[PDB]
Design a binder for these strands. Structure first.
Length: 117
RNA sequence: AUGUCUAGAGUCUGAUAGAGGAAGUUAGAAUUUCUGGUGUAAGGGUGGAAUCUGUUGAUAUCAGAAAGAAUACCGGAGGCG
């Protein structure tokens, strides 16, 4: 039984999966959840509905860590990232900032090759 | 074969644009690996799966260190050779 008050919620929303981590301001992780862990599999893992369920389950995991004050971090092009933020709002835990940490290189590390050569 | 001229072509003077070339320095983002924390059962991937990765602590997240390669935005019915 601890009280933190402040916190962060990281959300990675790629084309295959959604991962939601709830962590301190320092960044130390309190809990996490994922679409694969929420029982979905296959294309369901990347639908906006699965993102909504994953996020709200992640926060329900941490109902009793005495936090109501979060910074949202988003990366990835997934369709339902807005749904993740919307569900975080729907749970009633208030947000103070929304950010993106999507890595944009300065042209290094030549990427993968195209599909269907 | 020997002269003459300046409009062709050059030299000199002045102005000016440019990823032109070579050599020597420097930079940050991102990625990977390694080390140290938080934390748990998935991660990853496809039309759909599996191989693979992960309970020897993954993925995710925070901090530090190292190396390599390439230079987003400017940036195009551009510029130079």
């Amino acid at each position: 039984k601890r009280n933190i008050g402040e916190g962060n919620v990281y959300i990675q929303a790629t084309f295959n999966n959604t991962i939601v981590t709830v962590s301190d301001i320092k960044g130390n992780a309190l809990a996490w959840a994922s679409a694969g862990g929420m029982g979905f599999k296959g294309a369901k893992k990347s639908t906006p509905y699965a993102a909504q369920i994953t996020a709200e389950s992640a926060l329900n995991k941490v109902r009793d860590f005495g936090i109501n004050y979060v910074h949202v971090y988003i990366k990835g092009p997934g369709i339902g990232r807005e749904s993740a933020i919307r569900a975080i709002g729907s749970i009633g835990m208030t947000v103070k900032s929304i950010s993106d940490i999507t890595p944009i290189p300065h042209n290094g590390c030549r990427p993968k090759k195209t599909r269907r050569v």
